[PDB]
Amino acid sequence: DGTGISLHRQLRAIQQLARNVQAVLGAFERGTADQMLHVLLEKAPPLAL
Amino acid sequence: EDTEADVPVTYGEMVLNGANLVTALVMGKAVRSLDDVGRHLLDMQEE
């Protein structure tokens, strides 16, 4: 609307898109570590054997 | 018919200029001319 609130409601949808996109790009930085253990436990037989 | 011409005016407008943009959003209430009423309320108690 160009009024004082409809300038602001734009900014609230920007911060969500920013902090939605900051999480999922960081998720592959976390999904990398989760991809370690489920193929390192394809190998690595136990120490007792 | 005293004359045949008169003197009207134009619209005065009322826009959320300053503090009313915060009080409508951060709070709920948005009391009109709060730039002036807040000036008058801060002028009375200090004497």
Swiss-Prot record, chain B:
Subcellular location: Virion; Host nucleus
UniProt function note: Self-assembles to form an icosahedral capsid with a T=16 symmetry, about 200 nm in diameter, and consisting of 150 hexons and 12 pentons (total of 162 capsomers). Hexons form the edges and faces of the capsid and are each composed of six MCP molecules. In contrast, one penton is found at each of the 12 vertices. Eleven of the pentons are MCP pentamers, while the last vertex is occupied by the portal complex.
Family per similarity comment: Belongs to the herpesviridae major capsid protein family.
Quaternary data: Homomultimer. Makes the hexons and eleven out of twelve pentons. Interacts with triplex proteins 1/TRX1 and 2/TRX2; adjacent capsomers are linked together in groups of three by triplexes, heterotrimeric complexes composed of one molecule of TRX1 and two molecules of TRX2. Interacts with scaffold protein; this interaction allows efficient MCP transport to the host nucleus. Interacts with capsid vertex component 2/CVC2. Interacts with the small capsomere-interacting protein/SCP.
Protein's recorded name: Major capsid protein
Interval of the full protein contained in this chain: 296 to 342 of 1374
